Ligand binder design. Sequence first.
Ligand SMILES: CC[C@@H](C/C=C/C1=C(C)C(=O)[C@]2(O1)C(=O)N[C@@](OC)(C(=O)c1ccccc1)[C@@H]2O)SC[C@H](NC(=O)CC[C@H](N)C(=O)O)C(=O)NCC(=O)O
Ligand SMILES: CC[C@@H](C/C=C/C1=C(C)C(=O)[C@]2(O1)C(=O)N[C@@](OC)(C(=O)c1ccccc1)[C@@H]2O)SC[C@H](NC(=O)CC[C@H](N)C(=O)O)C(=O)NCC(=O)O
Ligand SMILES: [Co+2]
Ligand SMILES: [Co+2]
Lengths: 215, 215
Amino acid sequence: MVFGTLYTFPGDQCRTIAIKAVAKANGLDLDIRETPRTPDHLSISKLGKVPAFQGADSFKLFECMAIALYITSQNEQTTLLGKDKKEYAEIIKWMSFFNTEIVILMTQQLLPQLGVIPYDRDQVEFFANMTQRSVDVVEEYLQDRTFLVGDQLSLADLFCAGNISLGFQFFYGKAWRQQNPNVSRWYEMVCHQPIYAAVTDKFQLLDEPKLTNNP
Amino acid sequence: MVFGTLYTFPGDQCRTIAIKAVAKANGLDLDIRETPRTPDHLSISKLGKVPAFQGADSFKLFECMAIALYITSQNEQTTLLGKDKKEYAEIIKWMSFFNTEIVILMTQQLLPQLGVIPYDRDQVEFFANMTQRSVDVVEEYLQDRTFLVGDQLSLADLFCAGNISLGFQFFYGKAWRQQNPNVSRWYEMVCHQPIYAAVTDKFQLLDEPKLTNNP
Ligand SMILES: CC[C@@H](C/C=C/C1=C(C)C(=O)[C@]2(O1)C(=O)N[C@@](OC)(C(=O)c1ccccc1)[C@@H]2O)SC[C@H](NC(=O)CC[C@H](N)C(=O)O)C(=O)NCC(=O)O
Ligand SMILES: CC[C@@H](C/C=C/C1=C(C)C(=O)[C@]2(O1)C(=O)N[C@@](OC)(C(=O)c1ccccc1)[C@@H]2O)SC[C@H](NC(=O)CC[C@H](N)C(=O)O)C(=O)NCC(=O)O
Ligand SMILES: [Co+2]
Ligand SMILES: [Co+2]
């Protein structure tokens, strides 16, 4: 049957992509609800947050790290969670760093520029630079690394790549990628991994950013 | 020997307490560096963030979820990570919810009121209410629950309780706890668990908040 239901947004969502990806790779069918905050969704996430999950099990879950790990752990033969205890902890590290130090800061750079949230050129400039100072850590770490953790694809590669896809959607044009070659290579590499390509729209990159910090 | 070194702040820190707690419970000695951002600390966390960890191993880690899980997983007999795959995912859920939807929002309520960060009565009021709307979820969930996950103490109880201790330090006086009985009971219960009491200053609660949203 269907393994469970996943509440999300239409298309590719930065906190959802890995969840779709490892579900397919683990052979778990999912019912994708692309309409958020129905009675069913609030039953899981009272604050109405995407992603939210409920199994056929009828087991309930928010948050994205928890859902991704849950679905992944289903296959006991998976190689997406590290060789050993250290690589696992490392997978946890990158997943938490990307989700709090990159997505949360990039969100406050972005929403004002879409008119969701009040706009202040200086607030937005702050977040843009705080977001990039966190991405700079990854650029640097990836100097002469292929994968975020260990020597093969992990959940961190999938989950993090899906996270940072927010920036490739709006801000990271050719210039930015010239300037940030390792993150760009690694991101473009994870996007072409079949597990990840299978559950996403066609790969596409900005030429110029869709956004600069104008209102 | 010492199992590793932990960079933190002096005294009880909301993202550090569980890490100390499960290290002791697992019989791992830790060298506690209470002076952040030395050359050694930046070697782990280039952004200078607490907690950061390095084993005698010389294995390196930030972020707090990753460190806590790493140290905990050391004992293969631990009961702090759930009976099964669901309870594990649940432990991951509460750890991520407390760390992003409570600590991050409570931080922006708090820092302006300490003068770390610019102050705007309305910005602070926003965060205060967004912080409480996330805590309300826990109040509600804990109605007729003892532990966050399963039927015994887990890492989520320890880690989350340490997180929310920020609020008990500054904002949550007798009034607040009258108003929010389940979170209060559960917090006060985790603080009296010996594993957690062992690595903290004496238990103490506000009468009146140390802070209201004045500058
Ligand atoms: C970037 C992709 C996300 C879109 C974000 C939307 C968003 C809105 C709208 C919004 O109000 C905000 O982000 C948010 O959710 N909280 C927010 O305002 C309080 C914020 O600044 C913040 C949150 C947490 C910590 C610090 C600041 C911000 O303005 S993905 C869709 C959203 N998902 C999540 O937020 C899940 C997060 C959780 N940690 C997890 O599963 O990992 C979402 O559902 N937003 C709708 C909403 O009303 O909250
Ligand atoms: C609440 C206990 C924390 C104290 C927070 C201090 C703090 C300062 C100072 C600061 O600038 C800020 O919080 C921060 O770190 N980033 C911040 O500004 C960009 C912010 O608003 C934010 C961060 C992330 C997502 C959204 C917003 C905010 O003003 S604990 C000590 C601090 N630890 C961490 O931040 C670790 C977080 C990581 N996810 C993890 O290990 O889990 C710390 O070291 N702060 C110092 C600093 O300069 O960053
Ligand atoms: Co650079
Ligand atoms: Co109430």
